[PDB]
Enzyme design. Structure first.
Site, PDB file in Angstrom:
ATOM      1  N   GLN A  13       0.841  -1.149   0.000  1.00 36.39           N
ATOM      2  CA  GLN A  13       0.000   0.000   0.000  1.00 36.39           C
ATOM      3  C   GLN A  13       0.862   1.178   0.000  1.00 36.39           C
ATOM      4  O   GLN A  13       1.852   1.216   0.742  1.00 36.39           O
ATOM      5  CB  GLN A  13      -0.904   0.028   1.224  1.00 36.39           C
ATOM      6  CG  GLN A  13      -1.770  -1.214   1.351  1.00 36.39           C
ATOM      7  CD  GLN A  13      -2.939  -0.995   2.322  1.00 36.39           C
ATOM      8  OE1 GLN A  13      -2.767  -0.986   3.544  1.00 36.39           O
ATOM      9  NE2 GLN A  13      -4.112  -0.878   1.782  1.00 36.39           N
ATOM     10  N   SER A  37       4.833  -5.281   3.461  1.00 29.21           N
ATOM     11  CA  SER A  37       3.552  -5.435   4.148  1.00 29.21           C
ATOM     12  C   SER A  37       2.699  -6.303   3.210  1.00 29.21           C
ATOM     13  O   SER A  37       3.106  -7.415   2.935  1.00 29.21           O
ATOM     14  CB  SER A  37       2.928  -4.091   4.602  1.00 29.21           C
ATOM     15  OG  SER A  37       1.700  -4.253   5.347  1.00 29.21           O
ATOM     16  N   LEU A  38       1.587  -5.774   2.683  1.00 28.93           N
ATOM     17  CA  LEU A  38       0.808  -6.512   1.700  1.00 28.93           C
ATOM     18  C   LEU A  38       1.662  -7.362   0.731  1.00 28.93           C
ATOM     19  O   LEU A  38       1.434  -8.541   0.462  1.00 28.93           O
ATOM     20  CB  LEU A  38      -0.180  -5.593   1.001  1.00 28.93           C
ATOM     21  CG  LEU A  38      -1.033  -6.315  -0.044  1.00 28.93           C
ATOM     22  CD1 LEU A  38      -0.384  -6.466  -1.403  1.00 28.93           C
ATOM     23  CD2 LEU A  38      -1.881  -7.497   0.441  1.00 28.93           C
ATOM     24  N   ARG A  59      -7.496  -9.955   5.436  1.00 32.19           N
ATOM     25  CA  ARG A  59      -6.587  -9.031   6.073  1.00 32.19           C
ATOM     26  C   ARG A  59      -7.090  -7.598   5.825  1.00 32.19           C
ATOM     27  O   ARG A  59      -7.121  -6.743   6.729  1.00 32.19           O
ATOM     28  CB  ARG A  59      -5.194  -9.199   5.459  1.00 32.19           C
ATOM     29  CG  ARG A  59      -4.110  -8.375   6.113  1.00 32.19           C
ATOM     30  CD  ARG A  59      -2.800  -8.782   5.461  1.00 32.19           C
ATOM     31  NE  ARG A  59      -1.594  -8.183   5.996  1.00 32.19           N
ATOM     32  CZ  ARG A  59      -1.063  -7.004   5.686  1.00 32.19           C
ATOM     33  NH1 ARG A  59      -1.657  -6.074   4.879  1.00 32.19           N
ATOM     34  NH2 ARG A  59       0.064  -6.656   6.274  1.00 32.19           N
ATOM     35  N   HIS A  89       0.302  -1.538  11.711  1.00 25.61           N
ATOM     36  CA  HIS A  89       1.625  -1.951  12.192  1.00 25.61           C
ATOM     37  C   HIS A  89       1.963  -1.285  13.531  1.00 25.61           C
ATOM     38  O   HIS A  89       3.071  -0.824  13.750  1.00 25.61           O
ATOM     39  CB  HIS A  89       2.742  -1.669  11.132  1.00 25.61           C
ATOM     40  CG  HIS A  89       2.528  -2.412   9.859  1.00 25.61           C
ATOM     41  ND1 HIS A  89       2.584  -3.783   9.787  1.00 25.61           N
ATOM     42  CD2 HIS A  89       2.149  -1.977   8.635  1.00 25.61           C
ATOM     43  CE1 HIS A  89       2.305  -4.154   8.541  1.00 25.61           C
ATOM     44  NE2 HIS A  89       2.010  -3.083   7.836  1.00 25.61           N
ATOM     45  N   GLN A 100       2.928  -9.892  11.670  1.00 27.98           N
ATOM     46  CA  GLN A 100       3.145  -8.775  10.757  1.00 27.98           C
ATOM     47  C   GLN A 100       2.138  -7.658  10.998  1.00 27.98           C
ATOM     48  O   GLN A 100       2.415  -6.480  10.807  1.00 27.98           O
ATOM     49  CB  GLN A 100       3.071  -9.278   9.328  1.00 27.98           C
ATOM     50  CG  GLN A 100       3.581  -8.324   8.274  1.00 27.98           C
ATOM     51  CD  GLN A 100       3.028  -8.596   6.890  1.00 27.98           C
ATOM     52  OE1 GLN A 100       1.857  -8.848   6.698  1.00 27.98           O
ATOM     53  NE2 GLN A 100       3.896  -8.444   5.889  1.00 27.98           N
TER      54      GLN A 100
END
Length: 281
Positions: free
Chosen positions: A9, A87-88, A112, A193, A241
Site C-alpha cells: 500500500q 507489508s501486503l 486481512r 503496524h 506482521q
C-alpha cells in the site's frame, strides 16, 4: 544473486495492471468471482475512489503483483535467489515461493484487508531526515510514547503510527526538529503496524488456523524479523506482521550482506526501487 521485491500500500495507482487482466483472463475471473466485483474495473476506473480504501487496495495489489510476477517469469524463465515484499507485498513473495496458491493467497489478503479496514480513529505519517532510533527518542521525550514505528523503510525514512490525535501532535513536534525534512500524514484512518491493531491481529491469527501451507521454495525475508521464514513459522510470522514494525531497511541490508545482490521490483511503481538506492548510499 537477485531478489524480487513486491510493493504494498502506497504503490497502488489507477491504471495498474494495464495489460495483464486480459492476458490472464481466467485468473482475473477467479478473483472477481471470489471478491464480488470486477478487479479490472477497480484498477482501471477506480470507482468510488475504492482503490484507496484498504479492503480493496490489498486484494488489488495482490492480484496485480501476482499477474506481474507470472508475466515476468513467462518472458524470463529465471527464479530469484530471494523474495520480499512490503507489508501486503509479503503475500506476493510467499506466493512466488510456493507457500500457497493464487486463490488461497487472495482469501488471506481479502480477510486481512477487511479486518484492517475496521480500524478507525488511527493515522500514520511518513517522517524523513531522522533515523529510527532518533524518531523513537523524539517520541519518548515529547510525551508521545503511545506512537509506534510502523515502517523502517531506509536509514532516514520511517513511518509512525498511532491514535489520530497523537499523530496530530506529532506533526508539531517533528516540524520543530531541525533534521526533519518531511512530515507527511498518509491516507489511512487506521494505525497500521502498531499496538492498536491488537484485535485485528488476534482475529487474523485465529482465521489463519484454518489454513495449511506448502513448502517455501525461494527464501522469503520476513517483514517482522528481517530474516528468512522458517517453514514451520508461517502462521505466526504472518499474524505478527499485523501489529509489528515492517523492518524493510534491515531486510534489504540482510540481503546486501550476502554479496553482489541485485533487486527487481515486480508490480506497480518504483517505490521500493527508490528505497534500494537510498539504503545503498
Amino acid at each position: 544473486m537477485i531478489t524480487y521485491l513486491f510493493p504494498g500500500q502506497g504503490s497502488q495507482k489507477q491504471g495498474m495492471g494495464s495489460s495483464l487482466f486480459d492476458e490472464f483472463k481466467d485468473l482475473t475471473e477467479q478473483a472477481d468471482e471470489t471478491l464480488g466485483y470486477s478487479m479490472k474495473r477497480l484498477c482501471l476506473e477506480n470507482p468510488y475512489s475504492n482503490l484507496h480504501k484498504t479492503q480493496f487496495t490489498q486484494p488489488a495489489l495482490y492480484v496485480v503483483n501476482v499477474l506481474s510476477y507470472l508475466k515476468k517469469i513467462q518472458d524470463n524463465d529465471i527464479k530469484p535467489d530471494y523474495v520480499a515484499g512490503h507489508s501486503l507485498g509479503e503475500y506476493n513473495a510467499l506466493f512466488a515461493a510456493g507457500a500457497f496458491d493464487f486463490i488461497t493467497g487472495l482469501q488471506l489478503v481479502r480477510k486481512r484487508g477487511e479486518l484492517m479496514s475496521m480500524a478507525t480513529d488511527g493515522k500514520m505519517a511518513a517522517v524523513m531526515g531522522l533515523t529510527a532510533a532518533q524518531v523513537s527518542d523524539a517520541l519518548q521525550t515529547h510525551g508521545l510514547h503511545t506512537i509506534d514505528i510502523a515502517n523502517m523503510n531506509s536509514p532516514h525514512q520511517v513511518v509512525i503510527s498511532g491514535r489520530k490525535e497523537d499523530i496530530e501532535r506529532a506533526k508539531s513536534v517533528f516540524e520543530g526538529l531541525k533534521d526533519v525534512t518531511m512530515f507527511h500524514p498518509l491516507n489511512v484512518s487506521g494505525a497500521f503496524h502498531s499496538r492498536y491493531m491488537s484485535e485485528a491481529k488476534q482475529e487474523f491469527e485465529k482465521f489463519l488456523q484454518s489454513f495449511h501451507f506448502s513448502a517455501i521454495s525461494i527464501p522469503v525475508i520476513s517483514n517482522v524479523h528481517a530474516r528468512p521464514y522458517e517453514q514451520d513459522g508461517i502462521h505466526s510470522v504472518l499474524a505478527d506482521q499485523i501489529d509489528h514494525s515492517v523492518r524493510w531497511n534491515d531486510s534489504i541490508r540482510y540481503l546486501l550482506d550476502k554479496g553482489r545482490m541485485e533487486f527487481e521490483e515486480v508490480g506497480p511503481g518504483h517505490v521500493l526501487t527508490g528505497l534500494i538506492h537510498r539504503i545503498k548510499n
